[PDB]
Design a protein around this nucleic acid. Structure first.
Length: 44
DNA sequence: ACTGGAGAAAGAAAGTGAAAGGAAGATAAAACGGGATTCATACACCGTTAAATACCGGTTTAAAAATCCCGTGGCGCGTTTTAAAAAATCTGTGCGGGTGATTTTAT
């Protein structure tokens, strides 16, 4: 089908949780073993 | 003749670029007030003495202090207003990885 209904709450929750998890685990926090963010490690 | 669509005219309402001016700012010239020198000159400290004043004894008397009656306005109480100070609540902002965009010159 071209059109499928969807509730707003589920879409909002899923999108925001995905973005929050991505930011928390991949962009802003350092690792305890080497103290580096992914960008620093990739540059090095 | 009549109908309904379409294009052109005409008219009225809204947005526009330009407008003195005036309170509200801003910036200089001027008048002011507060320190460093430089002495001459008037001021501070020390012996001498004639004179002006403080002090005692006893009156007194006129003036001020003490006392009584009363009739008021000036403090005191209770209850409201009203600014003033204090506590509570909002508003910005920058740190570092991410998303997406702007402008002026030469040949």
């Amino acid at each position: 089908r071209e059109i499928t209904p969807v509730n707003i709450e589920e879409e909002l929750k899923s999108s925001y949780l995905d973005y929050a998890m991505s930011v928390i685990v991949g962009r802003a926090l350092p690792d305890v073993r080497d103290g580096l963010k992914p960008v620093h490690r990739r540059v090095l």
